Amino acid sequence: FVNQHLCGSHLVEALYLVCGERGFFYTPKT
Partner 1 sequence: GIVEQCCTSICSLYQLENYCN
Q: Which is nearer to Na ion, 17 or 21 (CB)?
A: 17
CA distance 19 to 29: 21
Residue 11 burial (10 A CB sphere; 0-12, 13-18, 19+): middle
Query: Does residue 14 bind partner 1 (CB under 8 A)?
Result: yes
Residue with nearest beta carbon to Na ion? 1
26 near Na ion, judged by CB under 5 A:
no
**Residue 9 three-state SS:** helix
**Residues found near partner 1 in the complex (CB under 8 A):** 1, 3-8, 11, 14-15, 18-19, 22-29
